[PDB]
């Protein structure tokens, strides 16, 4: 994570644009942090939230928020490590794993989606029943 | 299995959600 390598990647104008339709006090909170995280395009796990409450707590300044941006980015992200994770529990080795299967891996471990969270991801990637998880992961980091 | 993964991947269904 470096603040930098955030503002070379994302444009800081929407940065602080975001911050602003969300901010109160002058901070903001780290649900509507994340939430800005994601219309940036980047993708926040619980221990990221965590991180960030643990230091600054539960409403952060500009520069907190800043800081929480750039522990976000996640340069390391790799695809094949998302597909070799579905692929564990692809007990026939089918490439496929069906919609109640998966959706019982993302709500079960984890930082846990909600059922209908996890229902829904699925049924806005495929109308099928049988969910090609390579693809899916692909579709996921764009 | 492979926790940390499955954070990832939930991270990006979270954020596609958006």
Known sequence: ?142 | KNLPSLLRVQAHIRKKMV
């Open chain 1, 1 to 142: 994570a470096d603040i930098q390598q955030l503002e070379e990647k994302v444009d800081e104008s929407d940065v602080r644009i975001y911050f602003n339709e969300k901010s109160s006090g002058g901070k903001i909170s780290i649900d509507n942090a994340s939430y800005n995280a994601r219309k940036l395009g980047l993708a926040p796990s619980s221990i990221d939230e965590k991180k960030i409450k643990e230091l600054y707590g539960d409403n952060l300044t500009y520069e907190q928020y800043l800081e929480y941006l750039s522990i976000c980015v996640h340069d390391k992200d790799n695809v094949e490590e998302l597909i070799k994770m579905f692929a564990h529990f692809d007990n026939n080795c089918t490439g496929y794993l069906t919609k109640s299967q998966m959706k019982n891996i993302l709500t079960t471990w984890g930082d846990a989606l909600t059922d209908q969270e996890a229902i829904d991801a699925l049924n806005a990637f495929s109308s099928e029943d049988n969910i090609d998880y390579k693809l899916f992961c692909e579709d996921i980091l764009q």
